[PDB]
Amino acid sequence: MDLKPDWVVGFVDGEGCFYVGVSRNRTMKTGYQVLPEFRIVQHKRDIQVLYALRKFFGCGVVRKNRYELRIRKRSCLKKVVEFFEKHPLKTKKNVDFKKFRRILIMMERGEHLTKEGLIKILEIAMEMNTGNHERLKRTLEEIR
Amino acid sequence: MDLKPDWVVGFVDGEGCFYVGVSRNRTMKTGYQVLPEFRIVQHKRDIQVLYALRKFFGCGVVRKNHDDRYELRIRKRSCLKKVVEFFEKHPLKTKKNVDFKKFRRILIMMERGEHLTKEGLIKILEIAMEMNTGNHERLKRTLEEIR
C-alpha cells in the first residue's frame, strides 16, 4: 500500500477522530490526567489501510476495539500535528484539529500541571465536537 | 471550497457508498427499474463538504437524510458516468474498490440495455447482492417475484 498525502487528508477528514479525554488520576498534583488521542476505525476487511496509515506516520498502534489505529504517544502525535499543518483538513475536523493542537502544545510545555492550565484545557476540549462534554463539565466542577 | 482529486479519493474511500436499488415500474417490460446511486452522508455541520463534492463532480443533489444528517446523492446517468470515469482514473485504495467495481459493471450493463432483458436484469440483481450495501433481502424478494 502506497498513500499520497492528500489521500490521507481525505481519508482522515472522513474517518479520523481527534479526542481529548480527562480521567481522575490522583498521582497528578492536579488530581487529573489529560489524554489526547487520534483514532481511525475501520472494519476488519480494511485492516490493511490501518497498517498503511501506521506506516505513513511512522507510529501508532493497530488494535481491535472493529479495528483501530490509535495514536497516543506524544512524539507520534507531534508528527500527526505537523502533517496536518502542512496539509490541512477540509471538513470541520479542521476545527477539532486546531483545539487538539492547542492542548498538545500546552501539555508539551507543561501547562497542564497547574490547576489553571488544566482548567484552560478542559474549556478548550468542551469546544470540540468529539464527545464527553457533560463529562468534561463534571470534572470542571470537581476541580473548582 | 475546491478539492484535489486525491483528497476526493481519500474521502470517498472513507465515506462513499455505491448503492444499487430496485423498484417496481410498470412502464418497463421487465416490471422493474434498477436504480444505481452514489451517496455520501455527513452531519449538517459539514454541509459545505457535500456542496464541494457536488461542485467537484459538477452534478448531483444535496438533500436531507435523516435527523441531523444530509446527503450528496448522485443518480442521473450522465452524472454516474462522470463518477465512474473519475474512479477509473484515480482508483480507490480500500475495499470500497470492490463495491465500486461491481457498481461499474452494473452501469456498463445498463448502458448496453441489458436491464431490458430478463437474464440481464437477473444478472444485475445477482451482482448487486454481492455488494456490501444494506439492501439484500429486497433484492432477494425481487428475484423471487421475477422467477
Q: Report whether B67 contacts B79 (CB < 8 A).
A: no
C-alpha to C-alpha distance for B41 and B84, rounded to whole angstroms: 19
Please report which helix (H) or strand (E) contains residue B146, including its range: helix B136-146
Q: Secondary structure of A103-125 in the HEC alphabet? A: HHHHHHCCHHHCHHHHHHHHHHH
The DSSP 8-state label assigned to residue B67 in this structure reads T
Please give the full DSSP string across chain A, using - where no structure is assigned: ----HHHHHHHHHHHEEEEEEEEE-TTSTTSEEEEEEEEEEE-GGGHHHHHHHHHHHT--EEEE--EEEEE--HHHHHHHHHHHHHS---STHHHHHHHHHHHHHHHHTTGGGSHHHHHHHHHHHHTSSSS-HHHHHHHHHHH-
The alpha carbon of residue B144 is apart from the nearest alpha carbon of chain A, in Å, by 30
C-alpha to C-alpha distance for B126 and B42, rounded to whole angstroms: 30
Dihedral sign from CA coordinates of B20, B23, B28, B29: positive
Experimental determination approach used: X-ray
C-alpha to C-alpha distance for B74 and B85, rounded to whole angstroms: 14
Cβ distance B93 to A7 less than 8 Å, yes or no, reads yes
Task: For residue A50, count CB atoms less than 10 angstroms from its CB and return exposed for 0-12, middle for 13-18, buried for 19 or more.
Answer: buried
Q: How far is CA B63 from CA B40, B50, B54, in A?
A: 11, 9, 11
- In sequence order, what are the residues at sequence separation of 6 or more whose Cβ sits closer than 8 angstroms to the Cβ of residue B106? B20, B34, B36, B124, B127, B128
Resolution (in Å) of the shown entry? 2.0
**Chain B residues touching A5 at Cβ < 8 A:** 6
- What number of other Cβ atoms are within 10 A of residue A9's Cβ? 25
The label of the residue with cell 502544545 reads A105
**Chain B residues touching A13 at Cβ < 8 A:** 7, 10-11, 14, 49
Cβ distance B6 to A7 less than 8 Å, yes or no, reads yes
Q: Report whether B65 contacts B71 (CB < 8 A).
A: yes
